[PDB]
Design a protein around this ligand. Sequence first.
Ligand SMILES: Cc1cc(F)cc(C)c1Oc1ccc(C(C)(C)O)cc1-c1cn(C)c(=O)cc1NCC(=O)N[C@H]1CC[C@H](O)CC1
Ligand SMILES: Cc1cc(F)cc(C)c1Oc1ccc(C(C)(C)O)cc1-c1cn(C)c(=O)cc1NCC(=O)N[C@H]1CC[C@H](O)CC1
Ligand SMILES: Cc1cc(F)cc(C)c1Oc1ccc(C(C)(C)O)cc1-c1cn(C)c(=O)cc1NCC(=O)N[C@H]1CC[C@H](O)CC1
Ligand SMILES: Cc1cc(F)cc(C)c1Oc1ccc(C(C)(C)O)cc1-c1cn(C)c(=O)cc1NCC(=O)N[C@H]1CC[C@H](O)CC1
Lengths: 110, 110, 109, 110
Amino acid sequence: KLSEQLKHCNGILKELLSKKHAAYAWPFYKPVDASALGLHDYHDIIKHPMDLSTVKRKMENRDYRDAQEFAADVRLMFSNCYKYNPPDHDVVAMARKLQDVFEFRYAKMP
Amino acid sequence: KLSEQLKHCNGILKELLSKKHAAYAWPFYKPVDASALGLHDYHDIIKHPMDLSTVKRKMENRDYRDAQEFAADVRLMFSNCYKYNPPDHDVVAMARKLQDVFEFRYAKMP
Amino acid sequence: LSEQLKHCNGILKELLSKKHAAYAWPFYKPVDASALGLHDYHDIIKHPMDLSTVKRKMENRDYRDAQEFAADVRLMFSNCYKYNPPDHDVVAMARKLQDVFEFRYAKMP
Amino acid sequence: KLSEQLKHCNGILKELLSKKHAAYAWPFYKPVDASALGLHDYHDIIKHPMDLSTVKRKMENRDYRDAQEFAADVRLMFSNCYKYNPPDHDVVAMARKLQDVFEFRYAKMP
Ligand SMILES: Cc1cc(F)cc(C)c1Oc1ccc(C(C)(C)O)cc1-c1cn(C)c(=O)cc1NCC(=O)N[C@H]1CC[C@H](O)CC1
Ligand SMILES: Cc1cc(F)cc(C)c1Oc1ccc(C(C)(C)O)cc1-c1cn(C)c(=O)cc1NCC(=O)N[C@H]1CC[C@H](O)CC1
Ligand SMILES: Cc1cc(F)cc(C)c1Oc1ccc(C(C)(C)O)cc1-c1cn(C)c(=O)cc1NCC(=O)N[C@H]1CC[C@H](O)CC1
Ligand SMILES: Cc1cc(F)cc(C)c1Oc1ccc(C(C)(C)O)cc1-c1cn(C)c(=O)cc1NCC(=O)N[C@H]1CC[C@H](O)CC1
């Protein structure tokens, strides 16, 4: 079943947004505020931004056919991070920790 | 007299808020989202929260008697950072660099 | 897309390189289920994947675009993440190798 | 209670004076020596000088009714520096490095 998978994706997303992982999840909770930061190049480099509050909306909206679609957007999020920042920056540190939460639980789907 | 000083303070606040210093000013731009971060003790420890936004509004209402009441609040902000956080934490290092901008320009007061 | 694939082929070369061997070697060849007495590997892991199956496919010009390359690599980390418990060393060794992958994939033009 | 706070402020001042920080505290252990420096204007510009010994001496004499009066002099000290000197000068870097030691430990105070 497809939503049988999708409510397991939805459970992952609860976990990502949950407190336990907030120390490193917080910069993905909402989309990078390129305006407040002075990021004149952000939207030239990230053609398709993506963050967990977008993923939560698309989940509540029911825009997701399969769990591959879910996973595709979450990886997009992390890769935008890895693309925009240097490897030594603190966001990359965080984004890794979170992704490793995601990749693990995602791999335990039936 | 004490309003040519407040004019000078406004020029400071505008430099703090300026995009030049955004790299380390951003965490002070609005309140510290305790609920999102998971900070259940932030309001235990920090009894009088303060952000450059709070400062800007108090200036915009002309609710500052003199330059010292200005400085009280901008220091209260930095203190709260320094109280809530460890010394090794990135915010503190951001808070210090911002304070250095403030403290220097507050010292060139007429 | 071969311009993109030149870049993937470099990432693959980087993964197999000596720099990362510390944590790369459990993914170098197929997991040896005979060896380990893991009678339940192939029950749980339907589509196995190693870096040198990936190299074999790279050399055969099998990859259409970078998605196909990245799919087979992520599949590799995922089998590991699925088969194993989180506390296990390979789960950390895979996570270290993947970060190296995901970063460098993300820089791709 | 006041002499608990002033006990703590006392410990700050002992920390300021300590060997750890002496690389950047040395321009502040004693009064700025206008005479040694050939500075016929230092006292025109800085009406109310201050330094750590003057603070140590007041701490010794119990001239401080509370923690604010402590901090206000320790800040008048860093301010006198930021007011007299250019920002490119070593003293300003020193005053800052030492101030950030002070400001931190001051906020930890109950
Ligand atoms: C910038 C930064 C500094 C830090 F110390 C810790 C984090 C997490 C940081 O990253 C962010 C902090 C806040 C925010 C807000 C709340 C505004 O959306 C976003 C990020 C951030 C998040 N994500 C996912 C990213 O991919 C990139 C982010 N930020 C990039 C960024 O701001 N770079 C600047 C570039 C200019 C330099 O002088 C300083 C660094
Ligand atoms: C946490 C953090 C990491 C980092 F690399 C850079 C900053 C600025 C950080 O601090 C903040 C990031 C975002 C925000 C938002 C946007 C939610 O208002 C606030 C802070 C923050 C800002 N200020 C001024 C503070 O004094 C404290 C702040 N944040 C503290 C904080 O998040 N603590 C937790 C404590 C639990 C730990 O497991 C992880 C850290
Ligand atoms: C078992 C083990 C211990 C260790 F310290 C490091 C690794 C990589 C280990 O795992 C492997 C060791 C060798 C090999 C060889 C080279 C023979 O293909 C493979 C693995 C291995 C690799 N990958 C990618 C995996 O996902 C899982 C692997 N090994 C699973 C494994 O052996 N599990 C057992 C399960 C039974 C338990 O009692 C103890 C752990
Ligand atoms: C001049 C200088 C050079 C240096 F590498 C480091 C310091 C601290 C320097 O400043 C001082 C050196 C000695 C002393 C003594 C110990 C005599 O009180 C004080 C200072 C000094 C300290 N503090 C807190 C100040 O605010 C200012 C100080 N001195 C300013 C000063 O000397 N400026 C002149 C201005 C004229 C210029 O042509 C050359 C430099």
